[PDB]
């Protein structure tokens, strides 16, 4: 009976995910052995910080990572649904039904579900990229994570997406929106209402110079220099030493005249910003103050990649060769105080449209500060799902999808004769865990909300054409209500690309566990 105990080991981790999806979800504090606390609400990121022992759970963890890499959303739907398929299959194994026909039954039920997803599409996203149109897709992503911030964070995320996207329609050949185009930064102090949207990267460090900001001139030239600032010498060794005091006057004045000569040629070309990836000497900062050149140091090589796609600058392996062809252009750069400290940000005006934006977060809570940082990353991948593979189609969410599939699957159960009826019926019952989870965690009675969900999708209408309301989902209440309410009032929908991809992954996840009747391992 090892296959039964394997489900019980997953059942211990199943209840952990039942308290994740929904508005009742909470982040988990994990103390690493290196003395670092990583806090995230996302389940896929949580599995990376957790050490999995039993390899049977690793199959579900590897299936969860598939949801985060491609579609980036729906990781809670994959893990919870795959865990319920093992519970409904436990009764079939104990009943005497072999696991061979159980696996074959899921393959027939999966093909029947994918064909019905096209007829369940309610609305169609026009991909207008409007600020008001993006509020419908982003709202359910922020929902079931952090409560109360769905109204404020909806306008901040939707505004940054429209800045990095150009103007185009009905063209899917050339991709535009990437996953790195949206960066999230954090700073101590402020609130959510005072947060703004920046059209470019935000630098929270100090300029390290007496020049606070550049002028208002159009098309500022920005040059990225990987070579550090110093007098040109031999690449091999070349350490400056003083044998006697006579050579001190020649070596000291030589470094001052050589650096000043290189900065004069760069300032004449119209470059007001010099980006030095390496360290900057003491005498180099003295000449940059009189020429009015902004001092910027970016030691991280990851930040220079997204900078090349905005202004068009290119890193130069040498120093003192301001090639105008590889220089970048930015409309306006300003240094303002955001969050209590004066920092130099990066933005634009009209031309040189930036392909990367950054949203600044402000708040007095440290725990909820990193919560929004990890929550926006789940919303970034939602924009990627708007492409050709079923980006415009959408399905109603809030538990309305899993309940509606029950009536369609059971209708095809009696149509297919043979032993396949056992796996088809249990496949639809496994969808009942989603509506029960939201009602149990929210404190709603099972004897009340649950029977009203079945009566919402099942009614007696004297006619062939459907009518009344098929959009009624699972309601969290929170104030008062009688029965359930329409989901179309809050406009909470789920994309087809997210739901269709989550079904195929969850189906193959439970297939691997049921197919393994023996596990052989050894100590390390």
């Amino acid at each position: 009976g090892q296959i039964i105990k394997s489900i019980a080991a997953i059942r211990e981790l199943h209840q952990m995910c039942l308290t994740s999806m929904g508005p009742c979800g909470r982040n988990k504090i994990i103390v690493n052995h290196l003395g670092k606390i990583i806090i995230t609400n996302d389940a896929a990121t949580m599995l990376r910080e957790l050490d999995i022992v039993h390899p049977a759970v690793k199959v579900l963890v590897m299936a969860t990572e598939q949801q985060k890499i491609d579609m980036g959303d729906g990781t809670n739907l994959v893990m919870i649904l795959a865990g319920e398929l093992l519970n409904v299959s436990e009764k079939l194994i104990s009943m005497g039904l072999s696991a061979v026909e159980i696996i074959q039954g899921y393959n027939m039920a999966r093909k029947f579900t994918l064909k019905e997803l096209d007829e369940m599409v309610v609305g169609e996203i026009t991909d207008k990229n409007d600020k008001n149109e993006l509020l419908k897709m982003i709202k359910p992503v922020i929902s079931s994570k952090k409560y109360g911030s769905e109204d404020i964070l909806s306008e901040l995320v939707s505004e940054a997406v429209s800045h990095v996207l150009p103007v185009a329609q009905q063209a899917g050949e050339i991709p535009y929106f990437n996953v790195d185009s949206i960066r999230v930064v954090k700073i101590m102090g402020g609130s959510l209402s005072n947060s703004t949207v920046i059209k470019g990267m935000v630098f929270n460090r100090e300029p390290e110079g007496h020049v606070k900001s550049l002028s208002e001139d159009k098309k500022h030239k920005v040059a990225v220099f990987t070579c550090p600032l110093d007098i040109a010498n031999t690449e091999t060794k070349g350490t400056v030493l003083l044998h006697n005091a006579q050579e001190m006057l020649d070596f000291s004045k030589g470094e001052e005249k050589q650096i000043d000569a290189m900065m004069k040629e760069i300032a004449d070309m119209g470059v007001e910003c010099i980006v030095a990836g390496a360290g900057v000497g003491e005498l180099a900062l003295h000449y940059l103050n009189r020429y009015g050149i902004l001092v910027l140091k970016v030691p991280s090589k990851f930040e220079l990649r997204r900078l090349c796609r905005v202004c068009g600058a290119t890193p130069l392996p040498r120093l003192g060769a301001p090639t105008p062809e590889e220089l970048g252009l930015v409309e306006t750069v300003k240094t303002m105080e955001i969050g209590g400290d004066r920092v130099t940000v990066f933005k634009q005006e009209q031309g040189e449209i930036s392909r990367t934006s950054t949203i600044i977060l402000r708040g007095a809570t440290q725990n909820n500060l990193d919560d929004i940082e990890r929550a926006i990353d789940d919303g970034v991948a939602a924009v990627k799902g708007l492409m050709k593979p079923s980006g415009g189609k959408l399905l109603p969410g809030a538990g309305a999808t899993e309940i509606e599939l029950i009536s369609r699957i059971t209708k095809y159960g009696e149509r297919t004769p043979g032993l396949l009826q056992l796996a088809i019926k249990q496949f639809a019952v496994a969808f009942e865990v989603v509506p029960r989870t939201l009602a149990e965690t929210a404190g709603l009675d099972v004897n009340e909300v649950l029977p009203n969900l079945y009566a919402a999708h099942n009614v007696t209408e004297p006619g062939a054409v459907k009518t009344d309301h098929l959009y009624k989902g699972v309601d969290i209440d929170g104030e008062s209500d009688e029965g359930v309410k329409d989901i179309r009032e809050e406009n909470i929908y789920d994309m087809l690309a997210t739901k269709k991809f989550a079904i195929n992954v969850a189906t193959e996840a439970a297939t691997t566990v049921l197919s393994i009747d023996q596990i052989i391992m050894a100590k390390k």
């Binding site: 909470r26 988990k28 103390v31 690493n32 440290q366 404190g443 008062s480």
Partner: protein, 507 residues
Amino acid sequence: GKGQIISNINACVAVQEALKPTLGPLGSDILIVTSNQKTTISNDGATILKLLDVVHPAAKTLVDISRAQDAEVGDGTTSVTILAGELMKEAKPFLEEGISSHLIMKGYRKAVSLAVEKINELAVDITSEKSSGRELLERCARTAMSSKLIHNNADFFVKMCVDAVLSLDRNDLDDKLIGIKKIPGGAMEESLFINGVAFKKTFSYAGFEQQPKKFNNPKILSLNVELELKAEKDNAEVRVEHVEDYQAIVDAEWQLIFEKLRQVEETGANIVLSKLPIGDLATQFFADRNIFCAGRVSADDMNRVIQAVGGSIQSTTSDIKPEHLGTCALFEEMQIGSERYNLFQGCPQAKTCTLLLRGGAEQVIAEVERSLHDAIMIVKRALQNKLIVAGGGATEMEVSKCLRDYSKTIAGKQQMIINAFAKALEVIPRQLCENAGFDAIEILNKLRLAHSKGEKWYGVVFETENIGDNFAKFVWEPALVKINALNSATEATNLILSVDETITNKG
């Protein structure tokens, strides 16, 4: 599982139980022993809780909200931790009957919306009405000094406290700008208020330094490095090939320092300070020029001198520019405290001051030092924030009243939750009575009598046990405390009660 929720509630009770006696000026103090063995005793809950470093994850939330309580507000760090923990203790029996935690946590935020609108109705903006500039600071100073050993000597202490905040900007005020140094010995009523900075008199050795301490207009100059010859610690070894050359080896420091001896004479700076110990070489030439200098100056002491005359620190004495110098009105070093302590007076540009205290023991002054900080925080928040509410249990007892009537009009499970939320608010006035020795059973029962008569200003008298009004007792608290505490306690309460699992990795 469900057992982790109960285990997390009792884990916060052990931390809350220590913070209960620390509520109030007359309450008990926690004795904390750091790994460094340094012993610190104070009644301020901020520094206390920061020294616990509890491994339990939910206990870290109390530390996070304590930093925001001390930063944005600065007062009430003890009450915000007790109020946030009391809501979790009252919700323990509610979870054992099958009630989900989400309904209980949601009911807390329902009373928060009614509490924000209640504070605005209880906030009265008054400045010049029925008061003045001097009468406002004088009447509020004797309130924090009551029920203390300084109550008899408070007549001279209030006059020095009024002029303390007047020497600083009224728009921007900081409690750290007024320093307090413990001086053992002497009477407690002989202390005075000084605009400058004082030293610790670390030199117990005798036999030099004759000089009068009365100066007219000394010039202040900062020096970033130590300039000295005689050194008590290290020594120099000399081995060469000549007998007569043993002397000149240690003299390498002469010429460049010999020139710097007369540079101060040409500059005319009468005050020389450094963060490093200075030998007797600098104190040599300064005698005839009437130049005062003090060695082994702390790093925090020089930062207050730079902001005094507006000068700046320079590494050497050569390139010092004339704008780095500064001059005060008068320099007088008296024997107050049974020891000569240097001080500055008459600096118009000084952004900081120092309040000296005297007493027979250092522990007696430490009790007075923490008591004077409470009177400063009241004036600190009375300037920028114009909304003043009645504290000391007055507003606390009013919030619980109205919330009991609002629950009767709200059908559903929120009725018992809001009623329990207002019932948990009674821990604040209770603990204040237990710390002062007053009986919390009789007072809280008799206070609810007149509390329902329509007057919302009834407080708790901290001097003699009885019901009364804090308006006559001059007990005031800013409205920022009540707003920030209810928002931080509700967020911290709902964060811990929602924890279904405690995960800790070892390695």
